[PDB]
Write an enzyme that holds these catalytic residues in place. Structure first.
Site, short mmCIF file in Angstrom:
data_model
loop_
_atom_site.label_atom_id
_atom_site.label_comp_id
_atom_site.label_asym_id
_atom_site.label_seq_id
_atom_site.Cartn_x
_atom_site.Cartn_y
_atom_site.Cartn_z
N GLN A 113 -2.57 3.54 -3.85
CA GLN A 113 -1.85 4.04 -5.03
C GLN A 113 -2.31 2.88 -6.22
N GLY A 129 -7.38 1.18 31.37
CA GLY A 129 -7.18 2.59 31.51
C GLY A 129 -6.01 2.87 32.22
N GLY A 149 -7.51 6.23 -8.99
CA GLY A 149 -8.49 7.26 -8.39
C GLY A 149 -9.51 6.56 -7.69
N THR A 168 -10.26 2.79 24.65
CA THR A 168 -11.16 1.86 23.52
C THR A 168 -12.04 1.01 24.16
N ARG A 198 -8.03 -5.01 -14.00
CA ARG A 198 -7.91 -3.61 -14.46
C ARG A 198 -7.15 -3.61 -15.80
N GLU A 251 -0.82 0.94 21.71
CA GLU A 251 0.02 0.13 22.55
C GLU A 251 1.50 0.52 22.66
N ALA A 269 -0.09 12.07 30.58
CA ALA A 269 0.89 11.08 30.70
C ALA A 269 0.50 9.78 29.68
N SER A 323 2.88 8.45 26.90
CA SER A 323 4.16 7.61 26.91
C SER A 323 4.68 7.32 28.32
C1 LIG Z 1 -7.27 5.27 18.90
C2 LIG Z 1 -6.61 5.19 20.23
C3 LIG Z 1 -7.09 4.24 21.28
C4 LIG Z 1 -6.23 4.21 22.57
N1 LIG Z 1 -6.77 3.39 23.25
C5 LIG Z 1 -6.24 3.24 24.61
C6 LIG Z 1 -6.88 2.20 25.50
O1 LIG Z 1 -7.49 1.52 25.56
N2 LIG Z 1 -6.02 2.29 26.76
C7 LIG Z 1 -5.13 3.35 27.06
O2 LIG Z 1 -4.74 3.41 28.33
N3 LIG Z 1 -4.69 4.08 26.25
C8 LIG Z 1 -4.98 4.02 24.97
N4 LIG Z 1 -4.83 5.11 23.84
C9 LIG Z 1 -3.47 6.02 24.27
C10 LIG Z 1 -2.07 5.53 23.50
O3 LIG Z 1 -1.63 4.31 23.67
C11 LIG Z 1 -1.18 6.59 23.69
O4 LIG Z 1 -1.46 7.92 22.83
C12 LIG Z 1 -0.01 6.52 23.40
O5 LIG Z 1 0.66 5.84 24.54
C13 LIG Z 1 0.88 7.95 23.03
O6 LIG Z 1 0.60 8.74 24.24
P1 LIG Z 1 0.29 10.30 23.73
O7 LIG Z 1 -0.83 10.54 22.79
O8 LIG Z 1 0.09 11.07 24.94
O9 LIG Z 1 1.52 10.98 23.18
P2 LIG Z 1 2.84 11.65 23.74
O10 LIG Z 1 3.29 10.47 24.73
O11 LIG Z 1 2.57 12.80 24.05
O12 LIG Z 1 4.07 11.22 22.43
C14 LIG Z 1 4.12 12.41 21.54
C15 LIG Z 1 4.87 12.02 20.56
O13 LIG Z 1 6.40 12.04 21.19
C16 LIG Z 1 6.90 10.78 20.98
N5 LIG Z 1 7.49 10.53 22.27
C17 LIG Z 1 7.14 10.58 23.77
N6 LIG Z 1 7.90 10.02 24.22
C18 LIG Z 1 9.36 9.88 23.56
C19 LIG Z 1 10.45 9.59 24.04
N7 LIG Z 1 10.91 9.20 25.18
N8 LIG Z 1 11.40 9.40 23.15
C20 LIG Z 1 11.11 9.69 21.84
N9 LIG Z 1 9.98 10.20 21.40
C21 LIG Z 1 8.97 10.25 22.31
C22 LIG Z 1 5.91 9.92 20.82
O14 LIG Z 1 6.13 8.60 20.03
C23 LIG Z 1 4.95 10.70 19.87
O15 LIG Z 1 5.48 10.61 18.74
C24 LIG Z 1 -5.25 5.12 22.84
C25 LIG Z 1 -4.99 6.01 21.78
C26 LIG Z 1 -5.44 5.96 20.41
C27 LIG Z 1 -4.91 6.94 19.38
C1 LIG Z 2 -9.63 13.65 -6.49
C2 LIG Z 2 -9.36 13.52 -7.85
C3 LIG Z 2 -9.50 14.41 -8.81
C4 LIG Z 2 -9.07 14.33 -10.24
N1 LIG Z 2 -9.47 15.60 -11.06
C5 LIG Z 2 -9.20 15.16 -12.38
C6 LIG Z 2 -9.47 16.14 -13.35
O1 LIG Z 2 -9.75 17.65 -12.77
N2 LIG Z 2 -9.49 15.99 -14.74
C7 LIG Z 2 -9.12 14.80 -15.27
O2 LIG Z 2 -8.98 14.81 -16.32
N3 LIG Z 2 -8.70 13.68 -14.16
C8 LIG Z 2 -9.04 13.90 -12.93
N4 LIG Z 2 -8.67 12.78 -11.97
C9 LIG Z 2 -8.18 11.59 -12.65
C10 LIG Z 2 -6.88 11.07 -12.29
O3 LIG Z 2 -5.77 11.92 -12.83
C11 LIG Z 2 -6.44 9.65 -12.66
O4 LIG Z 2 -7.26 8.70 -11.59
C12 LIG Z 2 -5.12 9.16 -13.09
O5 LIG Z 2 -4.62 9.58 -14.26
C13 LIG Z 2 -5.06 7.76 -12.91
O6 LIG Z 2 -6.22 7.19 -13.63
P1 LIG Z 2 -7.08 5.81 -13.12
O7 LIG Z 2 -7.62 6.10 -11.84
O8 LIG Z 2 -7.96 5.28 -14.01
O9 LIG Z 2 -6.04 4.62 -12.89
P2 LIG Z 2 -5.34 3.82 -13.73
O10 LIG Z 2 -4.88 4.28 -15.00
O11 LIG Z 2 -6.37 2.63 -14.01
O12 LIG Z 2 -4.08 3.14 -13.20
C14 LIG Z 2 -4.23 2.02 -11.81
C15 LIG Z 2 -2.91 1.94 -11.19
O13 LIG Z 2 -2.16 1.41 -12.38
C16 LIG Z 2 -0.96 1.94 -12.43
N5 LIG Z 2 -0.44 2.13 -13.89
C17 LIG Z 2 -1.17 2.33 -15.20
N6 LIG Z 2 -0.62 2.18 -15.88
C18 LIG Z 2 0.72 2.11 -15.90
C19 LIG Z 2 1.69 1.77 -16.24
N7 LIG Z 2 1.79 1.95 -17.83
N8 LIG Z 2 2.77 1.20 -15.68
C20 LIG Z 2 2.84 1.23 -14.53
N9 LIG Z 2 1.87 1.28 -13.62
C21 LIG Z 2 0.69 1.80 -14.44
C22 LIG Z 2 -1.20 3.51 -11.78
O14 LIG Z 2 -0.06 4.28 -11.60
C23 LIG Z 2 -2.27 2.94 -10.92
O15 LIG Z 2 -1.19 2.74 -9.67
C24 LIG Z 2 -8.69 13.07 -10.61
C25 LIG Z 2 -8.67 11.88 -9.76
C26 LIG Z 2 -8.86 12.04 -8.52
C27 LIG Z 2 -8.85 10.97 -7.85
#
Ligand SMILES: Cc1cc2nc3c(=O)[nH]c(=O)nc-3n(C[C@H](O)[C@H](O)[C@H](O)COP(=O)(O)OP(=O)(O)OC[C@H]3O[C@@H](n4cnc5c(N)ncnc54)[C@H](O)[C@@H]3O)c2cc1C
Ligand SMILES: Cc1cc2nc3c(=O)[nH]c(=O)nc-3n(C[C@H](O)[C@H](O)[C@H](O)COP(=O)(O)OP(=O)(O)OC[C@H]3O[C@@H](n4cnc5c(N)ncnc54)[C@H](O)[C@@H]3O)c2cc1C
Ligand SMILES: Cc1cc2nc3c(=O)[nH]c(=O)nc-3n(C[C@H](O)[C@H](O)[C@H](O)COP(=O)(O)OP(=O)(O)OC[C@H]3O[C@@H](n4cnc5c(N)ncnc54)[C@H](O)[C@@H]3O)c2cc1C
Ligand SMILES: Cc1cc2nc3c(=O)[nH]c(=O)nc-3n(C[C@H](O)[C@H](O)[C@H](O)COP(=O)(O)OP(=O)(O)OC[C@H]3O[C@@H](n4cnc5c(N)ncnc54)[C@H](O)[C@@H]3O)c2cc1C
Ligand SMILES: CC(=O)SCCNC(=O)CCNC(=O)[C@H](O)C(C)(C)COP(=O)(O)OP(=O)(O)OC[C@H]1O[C@@H](n2cnc3c(N)ncnc32)[C@H](O)[C@@H]1OP(=O)(O)O
Ligand SMILES: CC(=O)SCCNC(=O)CCNC(=O)[C@H](O)C(C)(C)COP(=O)(O)OP(=O)(O)OC[C@H]1O[C@@H](n2cnc3c(N)ncnc32)[C@H](O)[C@@H]1OP(=O)(O)O
Ligand SMILES: CC(=O)SCCNC(=O)CCNC(=O)[C@H](O)C(C)(C)COP(=O)(O)OP(=O)(O)OC[C@H]1O[C@@H](n2cnc3c(N)ncnc32)[C@H](O)[C@@H]1OP(=O)(O)O
Ligand SMILES: CC(=O)SCCNC(=O)CCNC(=O)[C@H](O)C(C)(C)COP(=O)(O)OP(=O)(O)OC[C@H]1O[C@@H](n2cnc3c(N)ncnc32)[C@H](O)[C@@H]1OP(=O)(O)O
Lengths: 381, 381, 381, 381
Positions: free
Chosen positions: A338, A124, A342, A158, A269, A365, A130, A132
């Site tokens: 990607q 903790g 789908g 955590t 595929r 961290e 506080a 960062s």
């Molecule tokens: C899933 C999860 C688990 C966690 N578990 C733990 C745990 O077990 N123990 C624990 O102690 N903490 C834990 N944390 C806390 C975590 O490490 C903090 O969120 C982290 O240190 C960032 O703090 P913050 O959310 O207050 O962000 P902030 O400090 O508010 O930062 C907000 C944004 O400002 C940016 N920023 C801040 N200061 C600067 C700077 N000087 N320069 C540039 N950019 C800056 C940050 O990168 C960020 O993009 C956990 C957080 C999460 C999300």
């Molecule tokens: C939320 C959601 C909503 C959708 N809604 C609709 C809808 O309303 N109507 C509809 O008709 N369809 C819909 N789709 C289908 C969507 O457009 C298809 O998933 C998309 O055309 C890709 O087809 P696939 O998932 O079969 O991927 P695939 O064709 O199996 O492709 C898999 C991977 O291979 C890559 N790839 C495939 N061919 C090539 C190539 N020739 N060269 C290089 N890389 C290649 C693709 O980019 C991808 O990264 C929806 C899909 C989602 C996820």
């Protein structure tokens, strides 16, 4: 010529954790995420084979695994379930202030329980105002007789509510010098006045509980103190030098599980009469994923070895390995979604969860922005 | 815990080559580039301290340096002069087909001369119409008695005209099976019918001569043959598995010299009352440079160690290390120019040359596109 | 539906400048770069067809071209010769402080000469110790009777030594308020005490002279003043809001000429039995180049139209268009070199020059880092 | 000078949809996502103010909005709820084959119902084994008397189960020429033998139902035919040229809502004594987000205007705008999560949903990989 590779013992440990991960942990990952529930099956399989907290010294009933071994464990778990990987990762984070700064008595009281797996640890540090900026924390600990009274709150903890013990950092003198007026304490789940907040609803690592610690006049004995009064932040930050590397190892694992799944998928595929893997644009994407992952993996291993020796430049290498590996994991998981089309956007495949889980690695961290602040300090002095 | 670092002997070799590079090579780098002339000063300083071809076995009067040591040498030279780094890099590339496939007699004839530095080596693979597609080469070698007659041309040969000896790959049977109808030969600068083309005008590594080899009925003895008839391409590609890693090491060096210069510059230069280094956007850029460089460096060392052991996955790791390190060097040098502002765009600072030199690393020893083709083959089988 | 395209008159102007660029300018580009010499052929062809300074109002003998037309001219020239594109670009930069802030008499004295092409203009803002930080400049102008005496130096002046007239910004009160103690003056090439430094040796735009202005007690008449005493920096920065867009247009042109060349090349070149263009990894690269270029081009046209109307958000859009287009040009040119392989690294193809020229676009008229500072100010107020 | 901006009527339409989106749609977005339920509140508010299908011609009771206006509507909805944005987006996708290829009778039967909002439309192209490869689809339609009998399945249909009418593409001759043996039909929700699959569990746009259409001998009248037998794929792909632009507009909207939220957040949040917005590394990130978004927005508007005129190069510009804007939205949303720290990873802020929703834009209406295949075809002919 044994340069720049893990030892044979590290590769045997890799096959053993991979084996526990694929049989006992992986089958439950989708359900752990879907129900936002603790990975209990994974805890029990890790406990049964001594992977729940392997870093603890043999002197305390531990495995006494080195820093790289520990990274391989977290990596191989994170390959199949990111929530599960946090069992050894947060066990290390919470216990490390004791291992680095605690008395023999404090160590002897708490580490054996972690070693046998009767207890999990949390850490903790962060608060509402506080995160960062750790030095601005407001949780206070006040002497009362030989006791300490804690008041305030920690954010984002955590494994909170599951962990029995809580390494908590608090202000021990509001007038003392900034950065050097803070101490560490072990807090028990049943200490008086100690409650938890409602679990966070999160994007990923949903099975890992994340909750506020609330301290309402928590009275605890004087022997809860970890190291020296006022030296607590120093210990908490020294910890993060070691543990940042394990979040690097986690990110690598998440990225590796996403690449494994995408590769397997694009070999099977077919569109336009050919395997998706036969399209050169996809080959280039896969090469990029694999090359970046491997660069992140090696950089993590270099940082882990630095963590084990306590090299003087660990600060830079831990921040760079964590930052790099988390950035790379974010890109790779996004590309793995990607590559499944789908199907990759649905919860029937694991890649979308892996993308959701990868995003945390860029934030905890120490945000990747803070990682860059730390790396720039080291380059410029 | 000697994991994931160079040995103490590697770090002592690093200080020795750094010392030769900074005193004897660096002072002449701007003039080597500006006059597009061979780095003669660098050749003489490398020869005097045994860094011109360190990989040659002690059996031949060599240093017998391992693959990682050799990478550190090329890296430390490339930090100050990329043209100079090609002395050990192309000495290895040209000699490696002998070291891997040549008879004891061929090795005994040529390697001692390289070891003492009386002779440099070049490698002739690429042609006008067969760069990436090496198997389609048209240079022919025909038996005549015990002699060979070579006809055709090689393109883009580094250190051509300076090198005494030329490892040349040629078709030994135009009807034989694709990929397996080609042999390697050592060609001497004074062999009959052998000329050079006009030196290429290049973007960078301008002091490194790059020229066509022209073969007009070049008669050479039967004992010029390196390994077995038809096994020549096999040897040339096995070579590139090892040498791709040294181009990774070069890119790292170029990137390191650019980062060293930019860091030094932004600590000194003031705008708006502060050092340029005090601006957080610049800190983030510098962190990114340093983190990516270190990831490339470690990945090169992992590949070098694989080259030394001849690990079975060297093909993937050499292509990934070369590709990654060259991409990273391109980005870092471009950013180093940027960080100097106007000054970075002028030849009075070395960063613009370093940017120009970095770009070659993405092209030779196999374009980064070919590197991705090779990495995808390895992932998919 | 005449939304989001240039007018028919803009497309006719595009064919006319393209025609002058391809016939009269392009043939000399390699020699302009190779000899680091002014593009005299290009100046004469631009002057003969009224493209050397098209933005000047008809009232002064000008073409009175709008801001988008002017961007198309600079773009189409920059497609074939980046050095030549700076004739209209720096003519605008130097004259714009007069057009925006000068009296009718100042305008009437200088703009007709620019319009007929008897005179080129330069702009002197930057110094040795004040590039980005313009408000800290040290060049001084002191009243003496009705005259002004200028002392100091300007750095990096484009077309210096060729330009007859120099719009120079100088401190008119060292005790006045920061940002508001500076005035603009027209300085003639023959004014007393005015010399030039030795030409810079540069990475690219090598035919464009870049030289220091040295002012040793330069006495000039009181009527050289452009606008109001102390309002000079205000005018110089308002200028950069308009002219940043033309550097965006330049970058687009450089990127377009590089893409045109790479496309033509990969349709013709064959490896492994197919055109390079037939490889999907190359298709993806080409798509990325084309898509990013088009996004930069449209964003430039949107900013140009904003420049013509003097929209209130011009500051953001000019910085974004310049930054984006220059980043994109840097990436595309680097990829165009790559797509030609070995040939792309030689001066026999124009792509390496185009890469060298693209890099300046990230630095002048405000570094891309300063562009990001300006964009963030606009988003946050 | 009315170049390169929307008309005043477009800006008035923007304020009207923004107003409906912020008051009636935005309040329900978190609950629409959290319960994976249709945005009914949004449908009713869009229907009440004529934004549910604005592209339909006035001849049919429609608004007759041009292609850019329609993009602004989808953009402004997508700014607050991506699921809601799909009401006008899929209404266009489903109806467009009728608008482009249908008889006056087909148009007169279906478009008035869409115009009044009594009916939503869906589009059925993709299948289990033919996503990207549409020409390999296996859904069949066979003549029986004057009727058609449909057999097979469509995959991934947006707004399935809610939509009353389904534009379905099916093979009308299994022996006819590839690409030209397919026809389009309107299918009603109550046609015999027509069922839906279980709703997909998705990463994002969770309130948008996504379900399989199952066709078990679906008998439908001969007058369901849209355009000509065998010309159906031609119509379906011509549709995607127009509608790809609206998915670009969606991505822009998602990106804009994420940037709006992150900006607002970093002005308020303080660490180390300053607003997060005061850190230059954050300024640079915000500038990059804003600059890339604006480039995507303008490129979408250029493509929309091309869609309205039916320009000959629409194919390239629609693929480039969709690809670019979706890539940019993915990066920006990922960075918006990052900028909120821990808070950004929780469902109490909307940025994590926006990241989850952005990822679909890279996949539907043709994967970004297919977009690059289409762009490369256009560049190379
Ligand atoms: C899933 C999860 C688990 C966690 N578990 C733990 C745990 O077990 N123990 C624990 O102690 N903490 C834990 N944390 C806390 C975590 O490490 C903090 O969120 C982290 O240190 C960032 O703090 P913050 O959310 O207050 O962000 P902030 O400090 O508010 O930062 C907000 C944004 O400002 C940016 N920023 C801040 N200061 C600067 C700077 N000087 N320069 C540039 N950019 C800056 C940050 O990168 C960020 O993009 C956990 C957080 C999460 C999300
Ligand atoms: C939320 C959601 C909503 C959708 N809604 C609709 C809808 O309303 N109507 C509809 O008709 N369809 C819909 N789709 C289908 C969507 O457009 C298809 O998933 C998309 O055309 C890709 O087809 P696939 O998932 O079969 O991927 P695939 O064709 O199996 O492709 C898999 C991977 O291979 C890559 N790839 C495939 N061919 C090539 C190539 N020739 N060269 C290089 N890389 C290649 C693709 O980019 C991808 O990264 C929806 C899909 C989602 C996820
Ligand atoms: C400075 C310099 C020094 C050199 N020194 C030597 C030397 O000492 N010895 C020697 O033998 N050679 C040498 N070379 C040659 C160099 O390795 C070749 O240029 C390289 O192999 C590429 O060949 P190429 O120029 O013919 O390009 P091509 O093979 O014509 O390739 C052109 C473009 O097509 C791409 N491409 C080609 N094939 C594919 C594919 N299958 N899939 C996708 N993209 C593809 C390439 O990446 C490149 O972008 C040198 C080159 C240079 C520039
Ligand atoms: C070829 C060429 C032609 C030129 N022509 C002209 C001309 O005609 N007229 C003219 O007046 N000038 C001209 N210049 C000058 C040019 O615009 C300046 O170089 C530019 O303004 C940067 O100034 P500088 O070189 O002093 O860099 P510096 O201001 O020293 O900047 C050095 C580095 O610090 C970074 N930096 C500076 N301030 C900040 C900040 N606040 N936050 C973050 N990063 C920061 C910069 O981006 C850069 O990367 C020309 C320059 C060149 C190279
Ligand atoms: C895993 C999670 O989810 S929990 C942890 C999450 N939170 C974080 O990671 C916090 C991120 N922030 C930090 O790392 C720090 O607060 C930083 C890097 C931003 C620095 O903050 P600053 O206010 O600049 O702290 P500063 O550098 O002065 O450190 C305070 C004290 O700790 C010491 N310290 C800092 N880093 C270390 C270290 N690596 N090892 C030992 N001591 C250290 C300092 O030297 C100083 O003591 P001193 O004054 O006696 O020298
Ligand atoms: C440094 C410079 O500037 S010089 C060198 C520059 N040029 C290059 O790097 C060339 C780049 N190209 C190459 O690496 C290759 O030509 C590739 C990767 C494109 C493959 O080309 P292909 O026509 O596909 O060749 P293929 O893979 O069939 O190889 C031909 C033969 O060499 C063998 N071979 C290929 N790689 C290796 C290797 N790493 N180790 C051993 N043998 C190898 C093959 O197995 C085959 O022999 P086989 O048929 O008996 O198995
Ligand atoms: C093309 C080349 O190679 S030559 C030009 C190369 N150099 C550059 O582009 C310089 C880059 N730097 C700049 O643009 C500026 O110096 C900046 C953006 C860094 C701002 O520097 P600062 O010290 O922060 O200046 P500040 O913003 O206070 O501006 C000074 C004055 O000019 C005014 N000003 C600034 N921008 C503008 C503008 N776009 N329009 C009108 N006035 C402006 C300010 O309002 C202020 O006057 P005020 O105090 O009366 O308001
Ligand atoms: C929104 C969603 O979620 S639903 C839609 C999702 N799915 C998609 O977007 C599909 C992605 N795929 C496609 O766009 C196509 O299948 C492509 C680009 C991959 C091309 O596939 P191919 O098998 O190469 O098809 P081809 O280019 O031959 O097209 C088939 C026919 O349609 C025609 N056609 C293709 N594009 C168009 C177009 N833009 N306008 C008009 N006709 C077109 C072709 O000309 C051809 O007819 P023809 O032989 O008479 O010329």
């Amino acid at each position: 010529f044994d340069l720049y590779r893990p030892t044979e013992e590290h590769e045997a440990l890799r096959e053993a954790i991979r084996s526990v991960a694929e049989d006992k942990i992986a089958p439950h990952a989708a359900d752990v995420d879907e129900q936002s529930r603790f990975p209990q099956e994974a805890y029990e399989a890790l406990r049964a084979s001594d992977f729940h907290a392997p870093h603890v010294a043999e002197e305390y009933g531990g495995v006494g695994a080195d820093a790289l071994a520990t990274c391989i464990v977290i990596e191989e778990i994170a390959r199949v379930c990111a929530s599960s990987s946090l069992i050894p990762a947060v066990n290390k984070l919470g216990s490390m202030p004791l291992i680095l700064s605690g008395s023999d008595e404090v160590k002897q009281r708490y580490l054996p329980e972690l070693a046998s797996g009767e207890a999990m640890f949390s850490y903790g540090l962060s608060e509402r105002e506080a995160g960062s900026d750790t030095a601005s924390m407001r949780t206070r600990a006040v002497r009362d007789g030989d006791d300490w009274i804690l008041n305030g709150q920690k954010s984002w903890i955590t494994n909170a509510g599951i962990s029995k013990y809580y390494t908590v950092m608090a202000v021990t003198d509001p007038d003392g010098p900034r950065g050097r007026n803070i101490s560490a304490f072990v807090v028990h789940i049943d200490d008086p006045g100690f409650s938890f907040g409602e679990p966070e609803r999160k994007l990923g690592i949903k099975g890992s509980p994340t909750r506020e610690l609330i301290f309402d006049n928590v009275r605890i004995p004087g022997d809860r103190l970890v190291g020296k009064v006022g030296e607590g932040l120093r210990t908490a930050l020294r910890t993060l030098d070691h543990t940042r590397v394990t979040i690097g190892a986690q990110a690598v694992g998440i990225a590796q599980g996403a690449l494994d799944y995408a590769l397997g998928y694009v070999k099977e595929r077919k569109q336009f009469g050919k395997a998706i893997a036969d399209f050169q644009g996809i080959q280039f994407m896969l090469a990029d994923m694999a090359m970046k992952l491997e660069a992140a993996r090696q950089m993590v291993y270099v940082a882990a070895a630095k963590s084990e020796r306590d090299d003087a430049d660990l600060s830079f290498y831990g921040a760079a390995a964590k930052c790099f590996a988390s950035d790379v994991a974010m890109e790779i998981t996004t590309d793995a979604v990607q590559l499944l089309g789908g199907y990759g956007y649905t919860r029937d495949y694991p890649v979308e969860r892996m993308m959701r889980d990868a995003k945390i690695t860029q934030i905890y961290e120490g945000t990747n922005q803070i990682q860059r602040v730390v790396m720039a300090r080291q380059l410029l002095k």
